[PDB]
Symmetry: C6
Subunit: 131 residues, 6 copies
Amino acid sequence: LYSNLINVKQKVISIREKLGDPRLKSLVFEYPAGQLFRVTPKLKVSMVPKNMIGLPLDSKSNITISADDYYITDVSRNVPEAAFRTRAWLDPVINDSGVIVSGINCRCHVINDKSGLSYDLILRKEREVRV
Amino acid sequence: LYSNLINVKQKVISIREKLGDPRLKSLVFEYPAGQLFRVTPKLKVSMVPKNMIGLPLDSKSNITISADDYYITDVSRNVPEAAFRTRAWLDPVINDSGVIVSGINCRCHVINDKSGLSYDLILRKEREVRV
Amino acid sequence: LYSNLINVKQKVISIREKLGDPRLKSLVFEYPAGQLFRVTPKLKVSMVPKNMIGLPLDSKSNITISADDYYITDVSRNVPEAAFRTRAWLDPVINDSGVIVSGINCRCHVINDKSGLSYDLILRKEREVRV
Amino acid sequence: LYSNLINVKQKVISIREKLGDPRLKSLVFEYPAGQLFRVTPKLKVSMVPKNMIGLPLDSKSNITISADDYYITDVSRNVPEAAFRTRAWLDPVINDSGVIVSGINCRCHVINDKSGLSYDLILRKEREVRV
Amino acid sequence: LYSNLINVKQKVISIREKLGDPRLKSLVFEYPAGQLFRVTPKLKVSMVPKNMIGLPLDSKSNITISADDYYITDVSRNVPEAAFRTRAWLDPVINDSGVIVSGINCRCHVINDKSGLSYDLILRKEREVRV
Amino acid sequence: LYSNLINVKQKVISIREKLGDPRLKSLVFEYPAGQLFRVTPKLKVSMVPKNMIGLPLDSKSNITISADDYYITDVSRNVPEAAFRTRAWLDPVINDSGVIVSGINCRCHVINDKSGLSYDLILRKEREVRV
């Protein structure tokens, strides 16, 4: 069916969090304009190693940076597609208010959507991060 | 035989649309001069990730673009070959008239025709799109 | 034996034409000086995708072209070797005379002869074609 | 569980040191500010071959160096993550004091953390080493 | 033993010539200073495709050439090693005298000697050939 | 154990020399300062093909050379590690004295030590050789 398949995939994946593994990271998005959208499972993510590159703002400049990216493997399709056009945060903290203080700032760099029941995406860290 | 094989392939593939998967996208072509040709199955398509490149209009210019392409896997051979020389639209909308208002503009970039009973093609998005 | 093997290979391959597949293309050569040599089987051929390159006449010029090539897989060794040094035509038309009007002009670019009983060759389209 | 799994992995790996193999090297870190953190198992490490490169301090200079790196395969996750942000020493010697005299100076270059129960890391030798 | 193994390999390979295949080419060398050394089996050889390169005499010149090479697979180790330092001829003709009139001129470009009982070598055609 | 394993590996490999194969080459080192260290087995070695490169003494000069390297596969770990920092000779001749007259001069270029019971190394020929 592909409709209940994504939801059952979320239910079966929710077993992974009951086992304490350190690869699990909390991902949040800001899909609506002002407030946040959180992925339900505390999914796992790997880190592709860094590469030393020029600035993406101006490539032919003295300022250079290291591009750091994260590889998120099992992320449900139930999340809105337009969420991927908005900045994402890995391990964020929410206060008493609706804002976030600390976390690791990332932007969706490349989408892999070959599997029909889950997305898989790589997201690049911002050049300036909070923590 | 290869004649009825393409038609039976269309009939068996028409099962995929009865199952609700999000990878299915509607493809239309404009093979005749003025009006449209629609592929029968609501086939699936993947997105190859973007690459930052110079302008194809003038390569050695300040203006740069991102080349975005789509990978259409199961497309029948029953479609006319000359349709591939005309612009294509992914998820288009047809009004009361014969024209299209909105959709994602693409052009056939590379043809893979190794299989004798279906085409497989990658089509590059236009630099300017409607939606 | 390798002598009757090529001829039996031609006989068994002649079954493929009795089945209507669209990958079959008629190849002709002009091996003797003035008249034509036609390969017996209506063999199949794939199209390797195009690449944008400079002119082979002068590489460091403003004029650029797209190199288009065809991959012919099952072609018998019974054809003369020296035929491969002459221009080839894919889907040609012969009139009442011995000349050809229309067809797709190609030249043998690379030979693969690893198999002892058939050639396999890739042939590059001419920069100027008839149809 | 993933909690006792890392500790049992340390216990089973502690068998490797009871067998005398020469690939085993002692790794120490300086995770707290001033004193040292030693990995429990005398784990094995391979040497990726050297490459001749420019200076990382100034790339477009006359001074060039050879980048030498070590590939540490089985290293437990029980070590603090922040230890990887501090210099590491391969085969170090500790005196009567808390300082180290001799050893091979290295810095964590790339982290591979695909396995959920062990890290695997490559660490680049410093340009100036003690021994 | 490796001594009789090469000779038995020559005897068993001598079956291939009794079967008429077109991949068989006669190779001769000029290992002694003035007269010729012929390999015993009429071994087979494939043609790696051509590449357009600058002149090896002067690389940064207007004169360019195409490097054409041949891949000789089954060649016995019984031939002297020093024969490979001398020019080789594919399909040569010997007259009534000890000289050769026609043939395809080649020089040993790269040696593959991984197998302990046969050589395998690629030999590059000379820029100027006889036929 | 890994201690007797290297010695038994030397004993079992000493069978290879009792069979006459031409890939066996005698390797000697000069690990102590003045006299020689010979590897016990007459191990086999392959030749990686040559590459045309600039001078390693000055890269941006008119003088160019061909880098020739040898791939030594089965070499025991019982040899001292510091031997690899000294020049090596393939097929050397020892006179009545402790010096060597003729042989093929090589230097350890890259070490592969993934296997815990044998080294495997590639060693580059010197630009000037004796024979």
